[PDB]
Write a protein that binds this DNA or RNA. Structure first.
Ligand SMILES: [Mg+2]
Ligand SMILES: [Mg+2]
Ligand SMILES: [Mg+2]
Ligand SMILES: [Mg+2]
Ligand SMILES: [Mg+2]
Ligand SMILES: [Mg+2]
Ligand SMILES: [Mg+2]
Ligand SMILES: [Mg+2]
Ligand SMILES: [Mg+2]
Ligand SMILES: [Mg+2]
Ligand SMILES: [Mg+2]
Ligand SMILES: [Mg+2]
Ligand SMILES: [Mg+2]
Ligand SMILES: [Mg+2]
Ligand SMILES: [Mg+2]
Ligand SMILES: [Mg+2]
Ligand SMILES: [Mg+2]
Ligand SMILES: [Mg+2]
Ligand SMILES: [Mg+2]
Ligand SMILES: [Mg+2]
Ligand SMILES: [Mg+2]
Ligand SMILES: [Mg+2]
Ligand SMILES: [Mg+2]
Ligand SMILES: [Mg+2]
Ligand SMILES: [Mg+2]
Ligand SMILES: [Mg+2]
Ligand SMILES: [Mg+2]
Ligand SMILES: [Mg+2]
Ligand SMILES: [Mg+2]
Ligand SMILES: [Mg+2]
Ligand SMILES: [Mg+2]
Ligand SMILES: [Mg+2]
Ligand SMILES: [Mg+2]
Ligand SMILES: [Mg+2]
Ligand SMILES: [Mg+2]
Ligand SMILES: [Mg+2]
Ligand SMILES: [Mg+2]
Ligand SMILES: [Mg+2]
Ligand SMILES: [Mg+2]
Ligand SMILES: [Mg+2]
Ligand SMILES: [Mg+2]
Ligand SMILES: [Mg+2]
Ligand SMILES: [Mg+2]
Ligand SMILES: [Mg+2]
Ligand SMILES: [Mg+2]
Ligand SMILES: [Mg+2]
Ligand SMILES: [Mg+2]
Ligand SMILES: [Mg+2]
Ligand SMILES: [Mg+2]
Ligand SMILES: [Mg+2]
Ligand SMILES: [Mg+2]
Ligand SMILES: [Mg+2]
Ligand SMILES: [Mg+2]
Ligand SMILES: [Mg+2]
Lengths: 271, 93, 46
RNA sequence: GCUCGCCGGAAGACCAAGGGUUCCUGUCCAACGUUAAUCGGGGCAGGGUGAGUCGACCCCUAAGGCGAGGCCGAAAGGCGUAGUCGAUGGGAAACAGGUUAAUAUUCCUGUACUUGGUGUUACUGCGAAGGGGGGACGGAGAAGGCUAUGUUGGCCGGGCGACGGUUGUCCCGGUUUAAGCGUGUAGGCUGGUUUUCCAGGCAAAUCCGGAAAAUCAAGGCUGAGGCGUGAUGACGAGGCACUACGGUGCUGAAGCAACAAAUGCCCUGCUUCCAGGAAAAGCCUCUAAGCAUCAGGUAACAUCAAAUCGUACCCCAAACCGACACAGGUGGUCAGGUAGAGAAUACCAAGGCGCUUGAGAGAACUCGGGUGAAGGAACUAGGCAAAAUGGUGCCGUAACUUCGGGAGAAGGCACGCUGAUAUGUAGGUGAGGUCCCUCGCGGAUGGAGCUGAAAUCAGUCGAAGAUACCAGCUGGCUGCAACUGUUUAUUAAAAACACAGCACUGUGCAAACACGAAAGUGGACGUAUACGGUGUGACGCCUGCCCGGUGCCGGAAGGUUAAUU
RNA sequence: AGGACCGAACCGACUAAUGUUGAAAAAUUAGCGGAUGACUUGUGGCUGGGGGUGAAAGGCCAAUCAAACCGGGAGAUAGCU
């Protein structure tokens, strides 16, 4: 459900929100909570190393089981919850032995549905299996890059990965970006896509909305003096130069990937 | 238990003033100048021993010394401790 | 208006106090210089 | 001392921060005080700050700091693990009355409370660095129930009025009482209890989590206020005795109700929204090792202890920051009356002040104001400045529009007082009395009393009734920028920056990128619906041709070409 | 409901006059803008000089900023006065 607001004020005119009435309305599961205090894009030297980060709402961190290693015991979905730390929704699940966890909520998952992980689970959304046991051509998410490490790919709202080919110890994956990547067949993955695929349809509407998410304003380089940016200067609006980063690197087309260690797993670049 | 030498050193002088006289005639309280590091219990034991009266409660305060002038020279008097020692209503030390 | 000096004893002692100087070799050189010059007041502490 | 004037959401009061004797008393007037000074925040001397309950200290953590080993670095050092620090946050306990020249929740009187140690008695499973629960948390909004507080009436004491009237439906004043302890209320949340079993809680768990029955269908947690008690006490208007004229001393009346009412309390509640809202200990409860007719624990009771440091005084200011006794700056709390929507504003209370040169005169001219014949923008770069408008209710309101707006468009009418409707209405509150039941802080009814708008009709005064203060000028065309924001502290607030939106581009995660000789850290406890860079700048209709030049992307036949040999 | 509306506190600074050896090394007085938010404020913390930070004015970094301040190289050099 994508609902757009009425223009009762100029700040509301263009706002388009994403509303899910299915999501829990009370507090999150407390024992799976942790603090995550903000950084402002400052590292341990206290220097800004990523620009335009600051402020925003206070958030608590929800421990999310990306490994899905509780193998054998069925679990049932208790409720779907809002997570401030990521674009996707999360689901509080109860295993048959009384252990509760948070998982990423696949599309279609509702309260009461049965999930299971392991080598001997079934082919249905929310079930984690080694990619050795998942048929070629399935849609998966929360994919592992090393066996045992935890899901690292296809985690954001609406994303998925496709198993294109299995050959020997490796499986060929088509990522959301379009890159064709090999991964060990022992790496686990969850059936189905990530839900909340309407997340991309929202419109913030006003500057304050981006400030609520901890995003500070971007100043264009062409708007400043030459001492503090290569684009700076000009009597009036002048450019006359090839666009670069604030540190002088060409910023329209120049490739920056440089990793010979992982080159043997890229079957084909996104292009 | 506080030794006798300590007790002999803790008490300095019986403070004199109009307020101290009035405390004596109204609340049976004597006011004393004591050691800067003397605690309430040390003062109580020393009063009960050296003056041979019964104490129930002691009240203490530290006084700040005043800055002065002596022929344009900047000087300062020392901090000191004053004790309000209330006696058990039958002593008149 | 609001002038540049706003006294705060805690911030003063933390910035320029004796233990703040003693905590780094450069602060100890500050103290050595001031002793060699013969300053009556080594730091802000008292 | 009597008058007058000023502030009164402060120019009163109380604190934090900062200062540090400026506090109080005697004395002195050289210098200091923008004049004099008998005065002083000045000189000199003396005095003055009393705590188990307030605060610090202490226990616990945030950001952050330091950091045994460790990793890294010519050296100096950098980072960081276990730890240990770090409040602006969490953690036990006291109230009222009196008293000094100067302190008081600290002294005194009355009445309370908390934590812990030792002992004695009685019952007993006690035990952590480990498990669980709790502590524990956002914004907005709405309603009810209260109190602080006020007003009126009853009551009590006093009054009979400098000039006409004032024994009354008259005047003045007072009419106050805490924490604690019992009650458990308006209301908020939750279904209980007892069994059996279990892949969970780093092992054990009787605890928590899960599962299956039985059993009752109400139990439990929390909770403002009131009531009782505290209190036969305290305080009390006033009288009477001295006065050393600064005040002391003694006594002591009434001490009730109704209505109105917070932005405070119930309420960390309830409803709702998205941007999804600390930590750790105190605390409660599980057990492991271990002790085991002992230790330990529970309850009661007696007894001891609760140290140390601060406490004066100023604190929107003559004591702090501004070189000054400087039109400046400086966080929090309290919050009376009449009018008013109001913490606006006007006049006042409590309280505090008249701003540390005065006396005359009544020229030009300067500054801050009031009024102005006739004219009314003719002024001027420009209506700069000024004049003007200005409230509530009701009628009415155009182009255009993104259908919200435009709009308070524009414009207009009414408005004081008195009487009547109605000896005081609609509404609000609500005593008695009658009755019902699981008897109460219950329930149904009932309505005295108190309070009380607004409207209509008729009269009436004035030049004027939103009468003071307070309080939109309005409209028409057009450039720029969508909008709310931001900026040259101290000559520029804008058309500049940002912005939501758009596009290109990089980035497969030990991401790109940034900070760092490095180790590492941020990006991110994120994973392409993500993150970085760049340009453009809501929205609508759109965004054409050129790859010659420069940049980037791809290619690898041929030429040229480094160290090396 | 709202970066909604009118309007005090509070935050700011558009116009004018005054002041310019000022009451003030940036204020006063009358008007003015925002006033539930990209708000504002207390306490503490971190970022250090070719460095920081900057909704970007070369702004700000202790009345100092097209490279702070203090000490040193240091009696720099000065075909100039
Ligand atoms: Mg960015
Ligand atoms: Mg942008
Ligand atoms: Mg510029
Ligand atoms: Mg350059
Ligand atoms: Mg040009
Ligand atoms: Mg050109
Ligand atoms: Mg005492
Ligand atoms: Mg004391
Ligand atoms: Mg003095
Ligand atoms: Mg005085
Ligand atoms: Mg004289
Ligand atoms: Mg004089
Ligand atoms: Mg004096
Ligand atoms: Mg730490
Ligand atoms: Mg360190
Ligand atoms: Mg070491
Ligand atoms: Mg600590
Ligand atoms: Mg604190
Ligand atoms: Mg006093
Ligand atoms: Mg009341
Ligand atoms: Mg309010
Ligand atoms: Mg005091
Ligand atoms: Mg003066
Ligand atoms: Mg002043
Ligand atoms: Mg202020
Ligand atoms: Mg006012
Ligand atoms: Mg004149
Ligand atoms: Mg004039
Ligand atoms: Mg006039
Ligand atoms: Mg005229
Ligand atoms: Mg005329
Ligand atoms: Mg005319
Ligand atoms: Mg003209
Ligand atoms: Mg002319
Ligand atoms: Mg004007
Ligand atoms: Mg005017
Ligand atoms: Mg009438
Ligand atoms: Mg033009
Ligand atoms: Mg604009
Ligand atoms: Mg604006
Ligand atoms: Mg300026
Ligand atoms: Mg300006
Ligand atoms: Mg990394
Ligand atoms: Mg532009
Ligand atoms: Mg607004
Ligand atoms: Mg500004
Ligand atoms: Mg003004
Ligand atoms: Mg406005
Ligand atoms: Mg406004
Ligand atoms: Mg400066
Ligand atoms: Mg330079
Ligand atoms: Mg040299
Ligand atoms: Mg020279
Ligand atoms: Mg020459």
């Amino acid at each position: 459900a994508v609902v757009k607001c009425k223009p009762t004020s100029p700040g509301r005119r263009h706002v388009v929100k994403v509303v899910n009435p299915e999501l829990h309305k009370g507090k999150p599961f407390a024992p799976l909570l942790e603090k995550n205090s903000k950084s402002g894009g400052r590292n341990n030297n206290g220097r800004i190393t990523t620009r335009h980060i600051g402020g925003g709402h206070k958030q608590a961190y929800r421990i999310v089981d990306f490994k899905r290693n509780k193998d054998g015991i069925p679990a049932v979905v208790e409720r779907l919850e809002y997570d401030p730390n990521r674009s996707a929704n999360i689901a509080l699940v109860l295993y048959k032995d009384g252990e509760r966890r948070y998982i990423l909520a696949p599309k279609g998952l509702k309260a009461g549905d049965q999930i299971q992980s392991g080598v001997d689970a079934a082919i249905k959304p929310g079930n984690t299996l080694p990619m050795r046991n998942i048929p070629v051509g399935s849609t998966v998410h929360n994919v592992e890059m090393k066996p045992g490490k935890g899901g690292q790919l296809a985690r954001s709202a609406g994303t998925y990965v496709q198993i294109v080919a299995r050959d020997g110890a490796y499986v060929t994956l088509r990522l959301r970006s379009g890159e064709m990547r090999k991964v060990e067949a022992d790496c686990r993955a969850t059936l189905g896509e990530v839900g909340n695929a309407e997340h991309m349809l929202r419109v913030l509407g006003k500057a304050g909305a981006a400030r609520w998410r901890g995003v500070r304003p971007t100043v264009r380089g062409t708007a400043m003096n030459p001492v503090d940016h290569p684009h700076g200067g000009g009597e009036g609006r002048n450019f006359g130069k090839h666009p670069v980063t604030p540190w002088g690197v060409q910023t329209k087309g120049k490739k920056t990937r440089s990793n010979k260690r992982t080159d043997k797993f890229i079957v084909r670049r996104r292009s | 238990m506080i030794r006798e030498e300590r007790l002999l050193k803790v008490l300095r002088a019986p403070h004199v003033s109009e307020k101290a006289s009035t405390a004596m005639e109204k609340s049976n309280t004597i006011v004393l100048k004591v050691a800067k590091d003397a605690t309430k219990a040390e003062i109580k034991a020393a009063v009960q021993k050296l003056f041979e009266v019964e104490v129930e409660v002691v009240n203490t305060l530290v006084v700040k010394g005043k800055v002065k002038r002596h022929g344009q020279r900047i000087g300062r008097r020392s901090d000191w401790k004053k004790a309000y020692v209330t006696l058990k209503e039958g002593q008149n030390l | 208006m609001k002038r540049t000096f706003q006294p705060s004893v805690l911030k003063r002692n933390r910035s320029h106090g004796f233990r703040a100087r003693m905590a780094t070799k450069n602060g100890r050189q500050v103290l050595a210089r001031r002793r060699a010059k013969g300053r009556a007041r080594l730091t802000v502490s008292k």
